């Protein structure tokens, strides 16, 4: 019965799997499906260049379903058909899959009297929205995702899965679009969401690392570069060539300096041609976030334009210009006088954070502290007819 | 105003005989304007107490003093059907 | 059999969406109920079963003491399944819902269905034994679900509790694979067995 | 995690007047005369010197002992100082002006 579908596949197979696939006849016989679902998910980071999975899989779609969480079903299925890049036959085979368990649901909810099974309907959705980004039919996908976003919204007891297929699907749509705003944000959302569970590999970190870098370095709005640094997953791959100047452009932008950046836009020139045309943009964006900095990091709020004009390496005319640009993005409001040569402003969007900005508003605090202190005894002692 | 009528009295009988003293305190809370006005206990009178002079030995051992917050009301059940006593209000600290 | 308390404590878990008992093991625990409600009421009708979970995040408290079966079920109708068991915890909660009853005469018993093995420790568990003999609490472990493919060290436990007692302490083995989960606790001693002084 | 509602307290009018009259004190609801309101001054500014302390303290404990990062607390703190005022500037001396006034 099963003992083709397991035979057939090892030869296919590397010999190393081989052990695999006879583990899968030791569960069905125990009839014991705990072990057996632990042991599919684990199959396709061993054979993720070998669709041999796929075919597993079908025979486990019509057998344990409910006896198998739909969790489970929905992330070993997905491995298999993301990497599929016969995108028909990904979107042929989620829709059947997708008709079993809206029939099997309605009695099953009584029956076992313990389960659910309306949970997993939502994620197919997903998966189906996913195969149609790469297909590249990226409105088709976005309307699904957009009734897919109503649903869930209504709910508050869906699992930590749900959310995570979700943002992942969103992300993907801003990518192919090159929104790089939204691709940040929507990204981050996914990395929070992370289960300790298999539904990620050792790829995908890597490969978000770099989405991410790309997408930070050309926001319009971004100064998210400290939060990046900070974060474990950009943390780890610095090491290799491709992570390495994007780590070290990442790191120059945090800090303000403009020996270090400067000499990496150079390499970036003839090495990317994404960052070949994004030459002007990148320089401009160095001294729009070094120009916040400067007067902010100050406790006087009103500043000079002499003192910015050596700092962002630029004259007076430019300077009024970042200054203009930013209050129409909405990242300070203020004023600009060339009457009398300031910048006086007013508003802050929030800093980056870093142990010693921390240091920098402590000793800040204290400054005003001792002015409520010291009046607070005055005027106790003061009145003699507080109640008489 | 705070005074009983007929059915209200047979309601009040048979806390009485549940309880050996019990009050009775009624709320009329749209003549109350200081939450505490338009409040009044009252206590059943027996109709010994009235034929043998045995109604005013709650004058007696206390403060002796009554305090009216409708003087018509009040005084119509004071002999028919209820003795009125005056009512006090108490907190601890931690409520205070 | 006469007045007597009993804490049902049974686990949903990742080992009970197997279906070694028909059609799931969720299906034949729910069977399982019915039956040791109405023997308790055979004995004595002032028997009162309650029931906890050790299933979840957190153990917690799916029904009260009740004279009704319906209700008992009521509540296990919406459990958890994705946790496992949690077997000190689990103790700890049924000696409080004991305590709570209509009347103090009736037996201190627990009963805990084991479908998982322990998330807890031996450090916890030794710790528990000690706790339950001065407040003559039985554990009575009716396993079925450590013993699959698992070894269980919960012998120790039911030996150091028993002495004259309210009710007994006894382990009841109830094979793994079919053998319908629901009349094997029903034979086995679970009134059968009795205290004394 | 927990989101804090502010609360300031309500009752109606149903309930209200037995409070007011019960009450047998100056209040912290209600107010008498000048007097009253010199101690309503002292207690007010007494409140912002504790509770300035807390967030110093606070900022202590994140580079000492090193409890985790809020940028909910970091981030609300950082408007704070652009909506600091600061002396020398043509504002201050529109309020001599009203004091003069009044």
């Not at chain 1, 474990?232 to 090491?239: D, K, R």
């Not at chain 3, 309210?166 to 009795?194: D, Q, W």
Request: net charge negative; hydrophobic share 40%.
């Amino acid at each position: 019965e099963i003992d083709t579908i397991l035979s057939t596949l090892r030869m296919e197979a590397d010999p190393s799997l081989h052990p695999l696939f006879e583990q899968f006849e030791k569960f069905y016989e125990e009839k014991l499906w705990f072990q057996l679902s632990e042991s599919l998910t684990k199959f396709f980071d061993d054979a993720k260049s070998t669709p041999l999975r796929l075919r597993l899989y079908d025979n486990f779609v019509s057998k344990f379903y409910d006896k198998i969480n739909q969790l489970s079903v929905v992330k070993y299925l997905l491995a298999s058909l993301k990497d599929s890049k016969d995108f028909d036959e990904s979107l042929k085979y989620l829709d059947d899959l997708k008709a079993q368990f809206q029939e099997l649901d309605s009695k099953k909810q009584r029956n076992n009297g313990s389960k659910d099974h309306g949970d997993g309907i939502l994620l197919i959705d997903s998966e189906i929205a996913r195969t149609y980004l790469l297909k590249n039919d990226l409105v088709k996908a976005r309307d699904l995702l957009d009734d897919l976003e109503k649903t869930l919204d209504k709910k508050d007891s869906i699992p930590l899965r749900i959310t995570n297929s979700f943002y992942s699907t969103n992300s993907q749509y801003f990518k192919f679009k090159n929104d790089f705003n939204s691709f940040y944000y929507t990204s981050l959302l996914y990395l929070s969401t992370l289960e300790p569970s298999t539904s990620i590999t050792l790829a995908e970190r890597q490969q978000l690392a770099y989405d991410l870098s790309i997408s930070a370095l050309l926001g319009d709005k971004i100064y998210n570069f400290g939060e990046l640094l900070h974060h474990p997953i950009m943390e780890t791959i610095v090491n290799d060539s491709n992570y390495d100047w994007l780590f070290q452009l990442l790191n120059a932008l945090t800090v303000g300096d403009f020996d270090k950046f400067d000499s990496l836009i150079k390499v970036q020139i003839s090495k990317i041609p994404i960052l070949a045309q994004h030459e002007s943009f990148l320089r401009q964006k160095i001294c729009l976030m070094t120009l916040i900095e400067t007067v902010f990091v100050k406790n006087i709020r009103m500043l000079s334009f002499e003192d910015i004009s050596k700092a962002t390496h630029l004259p007076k005319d430019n300077v009024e210009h970042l200054v203009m640009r930013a209050i129409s993005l909405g990242l300070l409001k203020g004023s600009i006088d060339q009457v009398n040569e300031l910048v006086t402003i007013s508003w802050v969007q929030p800093r980056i954070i870093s142990g010693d900005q921390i240091t920098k508003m402590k000793d800040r605090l204290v400054e005003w502290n001792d002015q409520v202190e010291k009046l607070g005894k005055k005027m106790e002692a003061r009145g003699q007819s507080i109640w008489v | 105003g705070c005074w009983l009528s007929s059915v209200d009295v047979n309601t009040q009988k048979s806390f009485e005989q549940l309880n050996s003293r019990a009050v009775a305190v009624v709320v009329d809370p749209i003549q109350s304007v200081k939450g505490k006005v338009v409040i009044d206990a009252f206590r059943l009178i027996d109709t010994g107490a009235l034929i043998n002079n045995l109604e005013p030995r709650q004058t007696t051992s206390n403060t002796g003093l009554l305090n009216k917050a409708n003087i018509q009301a009040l005084i119509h059940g004071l002999n028919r059907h209820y003795y009125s006593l005056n009512i006090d209000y108490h907190k601890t600290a931690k409520e205070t | 059999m006469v007045l007597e308390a009993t804490v049902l404590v049974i686990d949903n878990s990742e080992y009970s969406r197997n279906g070694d008992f028909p059609r799931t093991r969720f299906e034949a625990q729910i069977d399982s109920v019915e039956f040791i409600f109405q023997a308790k009421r055979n004995s004595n009708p002032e028997n009162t079963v309650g029931l906890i979970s050790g299933a979840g995040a957190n153990p917690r408290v799916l029904s009260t003491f009740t004279a009704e079966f319906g209700k008992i079920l009521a509540g296990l109708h919406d459990t958890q399944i994705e946790g496992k068991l949690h077997m000190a915890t689990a103790l700890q909660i049924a000696q409080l819902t004991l305590k709570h009853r209509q009347n103090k005469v009736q037996h201190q018993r627990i009963v805990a269905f084991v479908c998982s093995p322990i998330s807890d420790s031996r450090d916890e568990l030794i710790r528990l034994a000690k706790t339950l003999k001065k407040n003559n609490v039985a554990v009575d472990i009716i396993n079925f679900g450590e013993i699959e493919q698992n070894t269980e060290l919960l012998d120790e436990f039911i030996a150091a509790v028993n002495n004259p007692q309210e009710e007994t302490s006894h382990l009841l083995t109830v094979t793994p694979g079919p053998r319908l989960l629901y009349e094997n606790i029903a034979s086995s001693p679970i009134i059968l067995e009795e205290g004394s002084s | 995690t927990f989101l804090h509602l502010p609360c300031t307290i309500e009752a109606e009018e149903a309930e209200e007047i037995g409070v007011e009259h019960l009450l047998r004190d100056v209040r912290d609801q209600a107010a008498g005369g000048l007097s009253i309101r010199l101690t309503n001054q002292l207690k007010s500014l007494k409140g912002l010197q504790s509770k300035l302390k807390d967030v110093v303290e606070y900022l202590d404990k994140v580079i000492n002992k090193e409890l985790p990062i809020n940028h909910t607390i970091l981030g609300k703190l950082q408007d704070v100082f652009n909506l600091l005022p600061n002396l020398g500037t043509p504002d201050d001396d529109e309020i001599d002006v009203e004091n003069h006034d009044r």
